[PDB]
Design an enzyme around this catalytic site. Structure first.
Site, PDB file in Angstrom:
ATOM      1  N   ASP A   1     101.797   4.152 -16.128  1.00  0.00           N
ATOM      2  CA  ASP A   1     100.593   3.604 -16.727  1.00  0.00           C
ATOM      3  C   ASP A   1     100.969   2.361 -17.521  1.00  0.00           C
ATOM      4  O   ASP A   1     100.172   1.419 -17.619  1.00  0.00           O
ATOM      5  CB  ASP A   1      99.982   4.613 -17.728  1.00  0.00           C
ATOM      6  CG  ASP A   1      99.104   5.670 -17.015  1.00  0.00           C
ATOM      7  OD1 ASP A   1      98.699   5.411 -15.872  1.00  0.00           O
ATOM      8  OD2 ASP A   1      98.796   6.707 -17.603  1.00  0.00           O
TER       9      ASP A   1
ATOM     10  N   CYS B   1      96.711  -5.011  -5.932  1.00  0.00           N
ATOM     11  CA  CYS B   1      96.768  -4.116  -7.063  1.00  0.00           C
ATOM     12  C   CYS B   1      95.451  -4.461  -7.839  1.00  0.00           C
ATOM     13  O   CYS B   1      94.381  -4.537  -7.200  1.00  0.00           O
ATOM     14  CB  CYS B   1      98.071  -4.295  -7.904  1.00  0.00           C
ATOM     15  SG  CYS B   1      98.454  -6.100  -8.248  1.00  0.00           S
TER      16      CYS B   1
ATOM     17  N   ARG C   1     101.990  -6.193  -9.549  1.00  0.00           N
ATOM     18  CA  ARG C   1     102.680  -5.200  -8.765  1.00  0.00           C
ATOM     19  C   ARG C   1     102.688  -5.719  -7.386  1.00  0.00           C
ATOM     20  O   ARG C   1     103.659  -5.525  -6.651  1.00  0.00           O
ATOM     21  CB  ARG C   1     101.915  -3.884  -8.773  1.00  0.00           C
ATOM     22  CG  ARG C   1     101.919  -3.300 -10.188  1.00  0.00           C
ATOM     23  CD  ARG C   1     101.046  -1.982 -10.222  1.00  0.00           C
ATOM     24  NE  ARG C   1     100.856  -1.515 -11.556  1.00  0.00           N
ATOM     25  CZ  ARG C   1     100.076  -0.477 -11.843  1.00  0.00           C
ATOM     26  NH1 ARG C   1      99.446   0.165 -10.850  1.00  0.00           N
ATOM     27  NH2 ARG C   1      99.966  -0.056 -13.088  1.00  0.00           N
ATOM     28  N   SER C   2     101.625  -6.414  -7.021  1.00  0.00           N
ATOM     29  CA  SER C   2     101.565  -6.923  -5.627  1.00  0.00           C
ATOM     30  C   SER C   2     102.672  -7.940  -5.382  1.00  0.00           C
ATOM     31  O   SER C   2     103.222  -8.098  -4.281  1.00  0.00           O
ATOM     32  CB  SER C   2     100.220  -7.675  -5.373  1.00  0.00           C
ATOM     33  OG  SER C   2      99.219  -6.674  -5.133  1.00  0.00           O
TER      34      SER C   2
ATOM     35  N   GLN D   1     104.035 -10.650 -13.298  1.00  0.00           N
ATOM     36  CA  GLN D   1     103.253 -10.884 -14.525  1.00  0.00           C
ATOM     37  C   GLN D   1     104.038 -10.665 -15.829  1.00  0.00           C
ATOM     38  O   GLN D   1     103.528 -11.005 -16.865  1.00  0.00           O
ATOM     39  CB  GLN D   1     102.026 -10.003 -14.545  1.00  0.00           C
ATOM     40  CG  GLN D   1     100.986 -10.417 -13.501  1.00  0.00           C
ATOM     41  CD  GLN D   1      99.798  -9.457 -13.530  1.00  0.00           C
ATOM     42  OE1 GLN D   1      99.784  -8.506 -12.787  1.00  0.00           O
ATOM     43  NE2 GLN D   1      98.829  -9.682 -14.409  1.00  0.00           N
TER      44      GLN D   1
END
Ligand SMILES: [Mg+2]
Length: 282
Positions: free
Chosen positions: A181, A215, A221-222, A262
């Site tokens: 998370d 994502c 995440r992508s 990111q």
């Protein structure tokens, strides 16, 4: 390996933050004029994340052609990917129009629909066989045919039908369900097993259109997925695999879509996934 001892050096010095800041400063800046047109305001999930005009995917039906999706064409690695935001309640029809028109075979999802009790993506595929989805704006029907639910990811067999022609295609939906998370996975083992399963499926073959990867904003995440996959390809093709420079690869990717990777933790995680994947690419 050296990016192996080179990994050790960056960890040692605590310079992930600095290397990542350098990437941000060096990244390409191209125009996103179409994404920013007033009529496209409700097609963007985050005002700060837009596709560049030069690489955006254009919808073909007679309407407005815009979707927040970018074609990442990795020339040396010989693989292309579409990175896109998690669809919004009003763009699921567009999302599946894109998958049809671009001839994708796989869709790779890197988030859950709700995380930390917050929505990250619309429910853009059917969860029950008997309750198919019809996207009346783009004239598509989507049906869940089966799913293979595993502890760390789920792979779904979806049938996408163009209701205009009655043509159907099977689309594989590869859903990594266990990204934490907060932060990145402590170990890249499940992420790599996931990538290798996507590879094993044939979804990344040049016989098919680019895999669609998303994502929530389609850059973090992508970003990590496409960066690891491309680096591992380059270390497999290149005359000397140690020459593959993950920061250079990531700058190359960011000519196609802004913001990929990111956080500094994401950049560290990508290195770790590539180092560990290489041992496996033995
Ligand atoms: Mg049932």
């Amino acid at each position: 390996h050296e990016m192996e001892k080179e990994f050790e050096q960056i960890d040692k010095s605590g310079s992930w933050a600095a290397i990542y800041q350098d990437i941000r400063h060096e990244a390409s800046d191209f125009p996103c004029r179409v994404a920013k047109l007033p009529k496209n305001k409700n097609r963007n999930r985050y005002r700060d994340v837009s596709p560049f005009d030069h690489s955006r995917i254009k919808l073909h039906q007679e309407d407005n052609d815009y979707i927040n999706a970018s074609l990442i064409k990795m020339e040396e690695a010989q693989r292309s990917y579409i990175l896109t935001q998690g669809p919004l309640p009003n763009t699921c029809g567009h999302f599946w129009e894109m998958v049809w028109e671009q001839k994708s075979r796989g869709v790779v999802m890197l988030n859950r629909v709700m995380e930390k009790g917050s929505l990250k993506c619309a429910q853009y595929w059917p969860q029950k066989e008997e309750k198919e989805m019809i996207f009346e704006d783009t004239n598509l029907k989507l049906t869940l045919i089966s799913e293979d639910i595993k502890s760390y990811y789920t792979v779904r067999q979806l049938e996408l039908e163009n209701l205009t022609t009655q043509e159907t295609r099977e689309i594989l939906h590869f859903h990594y369900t266990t990204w934490p998370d907060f932060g990145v996975p402590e170990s890249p083992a499940s992420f790599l097993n996931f990538l290798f399963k996507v590879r094993e499926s044939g979804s990344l073959s040049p016989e098919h259109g680019p895999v669609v990867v998303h994502c929530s904003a389609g850059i973090g995440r992508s970003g990590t997925f496409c960066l690891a996959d491309t680096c591992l390809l380059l270390m497999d093709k290149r005359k000397d695999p140690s020459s593959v420079d993950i920061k250079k690869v990531l700058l190359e990717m960011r000519k196609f879509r802004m913001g990929l990777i990111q956080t500094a933790d994401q950049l560290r995680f990508s290195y770790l996934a590539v180092i560990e994947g290489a041992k496996f690419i033995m």
